[PDB]
Design a protein around this ligand. Structure first.
Ligand code: CLA
Ligand code: CLA
Ligand code: CLA
Ligand code: CLA
Ligand code: CLA
Ligand SMILES: CCCCCCCCCCCCCCCC(=O)OC[C@H](COP(=O)(O)OC[C@@H](O)CO)OC(=O)CCCCCCCCCCCCCCC
Lengths: 122, 57
């Protein structure tokens, strides 16, 4: 259903990307003699993992989970770019613009804060 | 006057103040335990239980 700002404001939904019914498992055909675009690309992180520094002896560092501290401020959205059709048939998205970065701070066990610029610029 | 080495003998026939001294002793011991843990927490490196375990610290 078409919702309104007043419906969403303050709920945490403004930081959620749209979703598709469980039954949308179709296919979008690509007319190779046609030019395409992304009207809206939305990314919504759900987990942030950070490589622990494998001490001198090392052996193999894992990606450890982290805690988000900066709230529902993490999503990229309104991202646009053309969808080229390549000659080998592949498709290629080339970001032009969008809200394509969010500074995010997560916290590692022990309390180390890791700031990062969550982004897909260019 | 009681000599210094005998001051606490005033509890011998005074069960309530004996209990109160025991309570105070217990307080100081449980407080030590809390304070010692907090000092250890403030100084412990958890990042390497292989080569920097607690007993090395
Ligand atoms: C478990 C500890 C404890 C307990 C429950 C008691 C209990 C009692 N004492 Mg004893 N007493 C203690 C330890 C204790 N004392 C110690 C360690 C000493 C040697 C200083 C004495 C010396 C003593 C005397 C000389 C007298 C008593 C007396 C008494 C009675 C009345 C309270 C009083 O006058 O306190 C007085 C005692 C104190 C105020 C002790 C305080 C010690 C401080 C807190 C030490 C702190 C040092 C420093 C700040 C540490 C911090 C870290 C530092 C690096 C900065 C009561 C039965 C009196 C009594 O009735 O006797 C007939 C009395 O005249 N006590
Ligand atoms: C549960 C243990 C316990 C308890 C409840 C008592 C209780 C008592 N003792 Mg005994 N005693 C004990 C263990 C204990 N003792 C041990 C292990 C020893 C061998 C060291 C003695 C040796 C001893 C002697 C030789 C005498 C007593 C006497 C007394 C009485 C007076 C003590 C006084 O006023 O202190 C006064 C003490 C001070 C004002 C200051 C003490 C400062 C000391 C030197 C260093 C401080 C240590 C520090 C505060 C913390 C303790 C560390 C650790 C042990 C927890 C009292 C009934 C006296 C008595 O019989 O009177 C009739 C007496 O003459 N005690
Ligand atoms: C109802 C029967 C009963 C029970 C359950 C106890 C239990 C206890 N007595 Mg004993 N006592 C009894 C009857 C009883 N007593 C009788 C009839 C006498 C003759 C008057 C004594 C005389 C006596 C003396 C002289 C002393 C004790 C002490 C102690 C305590 C030592 C352990 C301690 O402090 O742990 C550490 C404590 C904790 C982890 C927390 C305790 C919290 C508990 C659950 C109490 C909570 C509130 C409660 C209403 C207080 C009443 C306590 C109860 C003893 C009546 C322990 C709780 C010693 C004491 O007081 O040590 C400080 C002590 O000096 N008792
Ligand atoms: C099983 C463990 C245990 C036992 C049996 C005791 C027993 C005792 N403690 Mg407690 N205590 C304990 C654990 C224990 N404690 C722990 C874990 C803590 C926390 C760290 C405390 C903290 C504590 C404080 C803060 C005090 C006591 C006190 C006392 C005494 C009260 C009765 C009295 O007047 O003695 C009379 C005193 C004696 C008989 C002296 C015994 C001497 C012992 C062995 C110490 C030996 C000399 C000492 C090592 C010199 C210190 C030098 C250093 C400062 C450089 C008694 C001997 C009180 C005390 O000593 O009152 C004066 C007191 O002030 N203790
Ligand atoms: C209320 C309940 C309670 C609980 C769940 C704990 C739990 C704990 N305490 Mg604390 N503690 C308490 C009360 C409590 N405490 C009180 C009241 C005091 C003040 C006296 C303290 C003082 C204290 C100190 C000083 C320390 C702890 C520590 C600890 C930890 C280790 C416990 C341990 O190894 O005990 C071990 C206990 C024993 C091995 C006791 C043995 C009993 C002997 C053998 C008695 C034998 C005689 C018996 C009467 C005869 C029985 C007859 C038989 C036939 C049945 C644990 C988190 C330790 C820690 O890590 O602190 C941060 C520590 O160092 N506690
Ligand atoms: C928080 C921690 C708190 C810790 C508190 C500090 C501990 C309390 C003070 C302890 C010090 C005790 C002072 C007692 C000293 C003093 O009071 O002694 C004289 C004192 C006299 O006892 P009387 O029975 O005459 O009582 C007279 C009363 O007025 C004493 O209260 O005897 C006792 O104390 C018995 C044990 C004496 C101790 C003998 C040691 C003497 C050593 C002399 C030789 C020195 C070395 C030189 C040779 C190289």
């Amino acid at each position: 259903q078409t919702l309104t700002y007043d419906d969403i404001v303050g709920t945490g939904l403004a930081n959620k990307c749209p979703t598709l019914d469980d039954t949308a498992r179709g296919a979008y055909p690509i007319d190779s003699s046609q030019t395409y675009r992304i009207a809206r690309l939305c990314l919504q992180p759900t987990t942030f993992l950070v490589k622990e520094e494998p001490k001198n002896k090392r052996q193999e560092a894992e990606f450890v989970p982290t805690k988000l501290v900066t709230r529902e401020t993490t999503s990229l959205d309104q991202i646009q770019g053309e969808l080229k059709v390549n000659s080998d048939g592949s498709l290629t998205f080339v970001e032009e613009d969008g809200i394509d970065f969010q500074p995010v701070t997560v916290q590692m066990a022990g309390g180390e804060r890791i700031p990062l610029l969550f982004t897909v610029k260019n | 006057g009681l000599p210094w080495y005998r001051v606490h003998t005033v509890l011998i026939n005074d069960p309530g103040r004996l209990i109160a001294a025991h309570l105070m002793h217990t307080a100081l011991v449980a407080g030590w335990a809390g304070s010692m843990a907090l000092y250890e927490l403030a100084t412990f490196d958890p990042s390497d239980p292989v080569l920097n375990p607690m007993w090395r610290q």
